[PDB]
Nucleic acid binder design. Sequence first.
RNA 1: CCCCCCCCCGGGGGGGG
RNA 2: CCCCCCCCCGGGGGGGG
Length: 497
Amino acid sequence: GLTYCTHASGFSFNPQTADAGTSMNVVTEQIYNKLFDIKNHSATLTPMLAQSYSISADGKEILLNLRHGVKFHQTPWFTPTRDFNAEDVVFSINRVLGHRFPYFDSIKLNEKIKSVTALSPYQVKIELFAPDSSILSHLASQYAIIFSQEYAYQLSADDNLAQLDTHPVGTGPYQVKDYVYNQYVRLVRNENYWKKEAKIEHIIVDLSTDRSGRLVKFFNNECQIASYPEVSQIGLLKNDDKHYYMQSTDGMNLAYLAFNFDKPLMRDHEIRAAISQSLNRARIIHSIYHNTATVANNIIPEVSWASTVNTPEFEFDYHPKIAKNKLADKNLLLNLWVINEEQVYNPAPFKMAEMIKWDLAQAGVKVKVRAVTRPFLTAQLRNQSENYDLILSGWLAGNLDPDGFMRPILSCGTKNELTNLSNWCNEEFDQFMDRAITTSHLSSRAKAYNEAQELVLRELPIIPIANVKRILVANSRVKGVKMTPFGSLDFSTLYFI
RNA sequence: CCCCCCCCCGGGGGGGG
RNA sequence: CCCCCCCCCGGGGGGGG
Ligand SMILES: [Ca+2]
């Protein structure tokens, strides 16, 4: 057995309905498979539930050839009577097309895909409205998990369709044995997996502790891997210890401040720029993240294939004297909302808020900080009653296609209320993004994404603060631990020496 | 039941990073 | 880590008894 300690914050057996950009979803990446995985900087598609695919010459039709012989989990709540096939893919993709899903609604997946049909039991046809170079990447994201149509059918007969997300059935290398809300998930190896079996038979995912206590549990041998350690407690760790080791990874893990474009005073570009210039972001990174983050003058991370070498100068970096000149006379009062949760991209949200409140005080701007819960925030956004000026947030992604993160955060939409906290709509921005998916040439796409990014850093609908590393500590008895920019920890490769 | 062919997985070996 | 080639095994599919 191995115990893996992580945060309970926004844990779910279903990321399609969870909040976008908050989690690598370590548990559901073990129990469900996708049609493809992307594992590398180059954006190679690894065949998973699809063995292969073709694209039509006009680029509007994709054929998925599904792997034969794949089994869904035999659990106490479900006995499958057929193998995975096209019906499962059609059910799964059709559900999110709507033929509330925050990620898919934020990318507007139903304005990309026209239909999804089974040509045969082992071949699916996707047709698009127009050529779209992003589609296969979205189907390789953590959100695009394939469910069991047979299970969903059985449950619909007796009304219990909610149980799809409470008692999971997947094709992945682990299955759910049992769990206790906010305490633990017990995983057991799938003995009928379609690829190399997981080496460790039993895995407990411990959710029951805050950052402080996770290293306590680790050194008291209550868990053998521990995610997202406290940052002051990394100072207590060494690299050359025989008994444990650390790993850390870059990726798409961004803390940022969004301006509410619904507030008339936030529309003034002079105000946003001066507010950006009031912030001592270097002080913030040093003081909150220590060494686990760098100041972010870019939306697109350097590990992304879309990243343009030459990180320029940010025109609105710390300059407290210019900020004070522009702001002091306006007698500004800003409401700053902070989400009261553990966040992969911000270890001390309130402490960061207070530092922002301080920096803006020096520029003569009064800030009232307001702690808020995810449920409260979610309700207000769904209800369009949100009345913040600033909100402190972030984005986490294992998918480094900018269509999968820049679009949810900043694109026009009516059904992107959970992800676009700026309430920002810019036609010029949206044209860059739409151009970026009309070609399959990486450099061509990158150019379009860099033009979009450059526009964002001029307009300042958000202020980027920090690119945050993901860290874990592992017990030296454990091998096969690979932390990567490109997804969650794969439990199936863990083993004991 | 058997025999071709295709495909996928796993394992072993050899060659090249 | 990976990628070819070979062998063995397992599974699926197609064709022929
Ligand atoms: Ca809104």
